[PDB]
């Protein structure tokens, strides 16, 4: 319910590191439309957590 547009920088198994429309490198859920170098419009809810502490 909240879209983030970004660019795919690396495919890592079942997940992908993408840029967001805020320039964040974030790991999201891998999709059909994924190729390193392409843009993807995804949900903010596709975004994983690295979990930081």
């Amino acid at each position: 319910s909240m879209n983030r547009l970004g660019i795919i920088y690396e495919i890592q198994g079942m997940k992908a590191v993408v840029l967001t429309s805020e320039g964040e490198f974030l790991i999201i859920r891998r999709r059909k439309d994924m190729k390193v170098g392409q843009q993807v419009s995804f949900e903010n809810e596709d975004i994983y957590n690295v979990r930081g502490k």
Binding site: I7, Q12, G23, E24, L26, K35, G37
Partner: protein
């Protein structure tokens, strides 16, 4: 015409990051939590790429010219060190063949036309 970047250019950027000891995963760890933070961090990277002397120091030292960034950006060394791998990545993007990602970063950082966090 198309707005796509090439995997070979993405990974060429990665080959440079490998020289610094940075992966795309390192970048995710260094991602600023909120807007104020990331506009600031990408802006640091921007001015680091905007200056050839800074960029060249960055490449040769494999680290950011922290003192030189600090005098131009007017930030804390703590800010620089926490986001160091991240700042390097965007700096490289502005001078690398990643023109679409450059465009994303540049438009995002110019959004400080109204920037008072209160």
């Amino acid at each position: 015409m198309e707005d796509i970047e090439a995997r070979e250019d993405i990974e060429e950027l990665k080959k440079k990051l490998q020289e610094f000891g940075i992966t795309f995963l390192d970048l995710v760890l260094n991602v600023p939590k909120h807007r104020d933070s990331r506009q600031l961090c990408i802006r640091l990277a921007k001015m680091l790429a905007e200056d050839e002397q800074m960029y060249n120091a960055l490449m040769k030292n494999k680290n950011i010219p922290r003192n030189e960034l600090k005098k131009k950006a007017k930030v804390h060394g703590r800010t620089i060190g926490n986001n160091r791998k991240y700042i390097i990545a965007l700096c490289l993007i502005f001078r690398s063949n990643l023109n679409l990602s450059k465009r994303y970063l540049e438009y995002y950082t110019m959004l400080e036309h109204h920037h008072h966090h209160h």
